[PDB]
Each structure stands twice: as C-alpha cells, then as structure tokens.
Amino acid sequence: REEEGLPGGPVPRINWPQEYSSFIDREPVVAKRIRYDTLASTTLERDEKQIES
Amino acid sequence: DIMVPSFVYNKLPVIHFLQEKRAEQKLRRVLDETYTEWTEELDQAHVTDAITRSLNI
C-alpha cells in the first residue's frame, strides 16, 4: 500500500452522500468525517526494533 | 573368607534391581515435572486504541 501510496490507515466502506441525506443534523455527520479522515491520515505502526528490545 | 562373601554375593541381585528401579523413578520424575509454559502478552489492539485516544479522535 505504501508502494501504492494509498492511505496507510484503514478506510471504512462508506458513502457520505448517503449519510448526508440520512442524518437530520449536520454536526454528527461532520464529526464522523473528521475522525475517519484523521484516522486514514495517520499511520498506526510502532518501531518493532524497540518493541523486540 | 567364606560366609560374608557368600551373603554379599546373595545380596547383589536384589540391590542391583532396586537401584535400577530407583534410577528409572528419578528419570520418570524428570519428565513428569516438565510442562510447556505458554506466555500471554498485552494485545496490541489496546495499544492501537490508546494511540487513537492520544490523537484526540
């Protein structure tokens, strides 16, 4: 995936245009996008040399 | 020269048998008290969860 260059973190299978329609209020929808966008932009890895050490 | 030697000779077989049994008993104990110890290590999912919380997500 690094060779692909795609977001390292997991990305949920979501269609936000549908979520926009479904939700009555914007605020929870926006918050959800903020979290997932941040999650997909962060690498969840620990240095395994120090861990083994 | 005669008596004590004869009785020692008579003793020999039983003592040999008993000592062989004793050695077998001790090796049997050696293997009996061996167990494979499976260690448990902190699941990395909790580490990932704590990392997420630190990000303020």
Report the alpha-carbon distance of residue B10 to residue B18 in Å, rounded. Answer: 14
- Residue A44: name the closest of B22, B45, B5, B12 by CA: B45
State the amino acid at position A46 in one-letter form.
R
The answer to whether A39 and A10 have CB atoms below 8 angstroms apart is yes
Q: Please judge whether A38 and B47 are an interchain contact, meaning their C-beta atoms are less than 8 angstroms apart.
A: no
Q: What are phi and psi of B36, to 5 degrees?
A: -85, 125
Resolution of this deposited model, Å:
3.7
- Residue A34: name the closest of A16, A51, A13, A49 by CA: A16
Report the alpha-carbon distance of residue A27 to residue A6 in Å, rounded. Answer: 28
Interface A:B, Cβ pairs < 8 A: 9
Q: Which two tokens stand for residue B42?
A: 């902190």
Place of tokens 């090796």: B27
Q: Which of A35, A38, A44 sits opposite B48 (nearest CB)?
A: A44
Q: What are phi and psi of A38, to 5 degrees?
A: -65, -45
Burial (CB count within 10 angstroms: exposed 0-12, middle 13-18, buried 19+), residue A10:
exposed
